[PDB]
Amino acid sequence: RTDITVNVDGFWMLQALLDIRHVAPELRCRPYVSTVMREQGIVVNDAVNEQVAARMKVLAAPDLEVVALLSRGKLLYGVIDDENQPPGSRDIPDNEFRVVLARRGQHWVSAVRVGNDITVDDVTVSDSASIAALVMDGLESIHHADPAAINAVNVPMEEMLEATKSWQESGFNVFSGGDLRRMGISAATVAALGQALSDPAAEVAVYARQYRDDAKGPSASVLSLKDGSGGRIALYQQAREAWLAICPATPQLVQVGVKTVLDTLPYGEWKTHSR
Amino acid sequence: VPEELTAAAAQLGTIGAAMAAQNAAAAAPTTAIAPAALDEVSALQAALFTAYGTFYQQVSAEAQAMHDMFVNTLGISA
Amino acid sequence: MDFGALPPEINSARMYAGAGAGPMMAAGAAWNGLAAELGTTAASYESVITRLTTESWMGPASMAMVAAAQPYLAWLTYTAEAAAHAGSQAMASAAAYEAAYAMTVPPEVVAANRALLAALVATNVLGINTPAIMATEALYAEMWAQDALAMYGYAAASGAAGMLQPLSPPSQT
């Protein structure tokens, strides 16, 4: 094995010894500003292992970043309901897993945070398929779900988001689905989308970002997967007005959705790109 | 020339009064420094400069006493 | 503790409250008002002992008076430098605060970002907004790094401004 794991304060010691200000924000560490490690071999003397040092240097400033927020239950996107939450807390919800896959040059480095622990390994990625394979064999170990027995359907973005905002006020009640079916959406789709938002078993959100001359830019498509009691559903903006793709989370379309995200990046070539 | 000595006596006593005068003027602004902000650096910085103006207020007091001797002693010669 | 371990909501709350540069520059001007009046008190001693010696008020023993005056004339010239120093260091002190306030993120600018994070999360029902949610989080970390860098740089300069010459009473030559 060629991996390490640190806790959040340990990750800071890494940034400190290497003089890195930030990592990806989904990792949710503290910033280092210019002012156990030795046991598990991560630090020799005063310096850092050369292996771990190179991966850290990727996370520190990568040309591209691909993320996967997964959750057992409803993805809370970082926010814990609490009054006793301190300002600037670096805790993440106990039911959240974060996956970051940066690439500087041709060095792909995965950073995975679960609870207060981060693990940093190298990662092997080639095309969209290998990247979709990580997200799925991670979601599948969260929860096993068959794809929804629905049919794909494209849908106007704005009208959907609005229709969805007002649908939520019902509890995503299947009675209040009228405005959705008056939009082209099959009936069974509404059933499975209803359940996937009302009481979900596991959700995923996959997006990506790119850098060129210190200028950040997120993909125009986000790929959300939700697990209902009516299967798994994939939703993602199609490549570009703007249109949403609501389809079953089958291996094929999940791969297409990930290809869409990776190709809606602001500065083009995703497998080969420099800042 | 006692007419020049005693002159230097009184002239130098009015310089020590004028010096004592500035000494108690600067007392309050050099020793009642509130912290600029509510952090630890702002507190340290004000505590020193007030400790310093306080310690200056004794050192100058002790200095003036010995100026008071020289103006007396210079004055005594006649 | 550590200033960098503190979230931006704290480093800027504690910096946007307090007395400002006001107390420190008043300290400064005072120190210069004494530096000035130590030296004018030295310049007139230097005028009487230097006319005492030159005219020779008490013959071969005029010396004895110059002698008597020296320990307190010395303290005058030495302490004037000390006070001018505290003057420039009281003000260096305050310019350090004023530079750290300048770079500290205003408290309302922090909580605005925090409320936008809460707003994008409530409306992220289809997860379409997640890139803005994590862009809002990165921007926060930037505020966190800016407040730390301001406090650390404040501490640094307040050391260089905390340097005072030791003060002492006059003792015999």
From Swiss-Prot, chain A:
Top-rank taxon: Bacteria
- Cystine pairs annotated here are none
Output the Pfam families linked to this UniProt entry.
ESX-1_EspG
Question: Where does it reside?
Answer: Cytoplasm
Looking at the UniProt record for this protein, which Gene Ontology cellular component terms does it annotate, in alphabetical order?
cytoplasm; peptidoglycan-based cell wall; plasma membrane
The answer to whether the entry has keyword Chaperone is yes
> What's the stated role of this polypeptide?
Specific chaperone for cognate PE/PPE proteins. Plays an important role in preventing aggregation of PE/PPE dimers.
Q: Which family does it belong to?
A: Belongs to the EspG family.
Subunit text = Interacts specifically with ESX-5-dependent PE/PPE proteins. Forms a 1:1:1 heterotrimeric complex with the PE25/PPE41 dimer, via PPE41. Binding of EspG5 does not cause conformational changes in the PE25/PPE41 dimer. Forms a 1:1:1 heterotrimeric complex with the PE8/PPE15 dimer, via PPE15.
What is the protein name stated in its UniProt record?
Answer: ESX-5 secretion-associated protein EspG5
This chain's source organism reads Mycobacterium tuberculosis (strain ATCC 25618 / H37Rv)
Q: Which gene encodes it?
A: espG5
UniProtKB/Swiss-Prot annotation, chain B:
Q: Which stretch of the intact protein is present?
A: 7 to 84 of 275
Q: Which family would the database say this protein is a member of?
A: Belongs to the mycobacterial PE family.
Location relative to the cell:
Secreted, Cell wall
Q: What residue ranges carry the coiled-coil annotation?
A: none
Question: What gene name is listed for this protein?
Answer: PE8
Function in brief: Promotes the intracellular survival of recombinant Mycobacterium within macrophages by regulating host inflammatory cytokines production and inhibiting cell late apoptosis.
What broad taxonomic lineage does this protein's source fall under?
Answer: Bacteria, Bacillati, Actinomycetota, Actinomycetes, Mycobacteriales
Q: Which residues form the PE domain?
A: 1-78
Descriptive protein name: PE family protein PE8
Its subunit composition reads: Forms a heterodimer with PPE15. The dimer forms a 1:1:1 heterotrimeric complex with EspG5.
UniProtKB/Swiss-Prot annotation, chain C:
User: What inducers act on this gene?
Assistant: Up-regulated in tuberculosis dormancy.
Gene ablation phenotype (knockout): Disruption mutant shows a significant decrease in the biosynthesis and accumulation of lipid droplets containing triacylglycerol and in its tolerance to rifampicin.
Q: Where is the protein situated, by its record's location annotation? A: Secreted; Host mitochondrion
From the record, give the cysteines joined by S-S bonds.
none
Q: Which domain of life is it from?
A: Bacteria
Record annotation: effect of changing Y45A? Reduces the interaction with PE8. Lack of interaction with PE8
| Domain observations | Contains nine predicted mitochondria targeting signal sequences (MTS), majorly spanning the C-terminal region of the protein. The C-terminal region (amino acids 312-367) is disordered, hydrophobic, contains a eukaryotic-like SH3 (SH3e) domain and shows similarity with the C-terminal region of mitochondria-targeting eukaryotic pro-apoptotic Bcl2-family and BH3-only proteins. This C-terminal region is required for secretion. This region interacts with host TLR4 and NOX components.
Oligomeric and partner information: Forms a heterodimer with PE8. The dimer forms a 1:1:1 heterotrimeric complex with EspG5. PPE15 interacts directly with EspG5. Interacts via the C-terminal region with host Toll-like receptor 4 (TLR4). Interacts, also via the C-terminal region, with two cytosolic subunits of the host NOX complex, p47phox (NCF1) and p67phox (NCF2).
The entry assigns this protein to a family as follows: Belongs to the mycobacterial PPE family.
For this entry, the protein name equals PPE family protein PPE15
Gene that produces this protein: PPE15
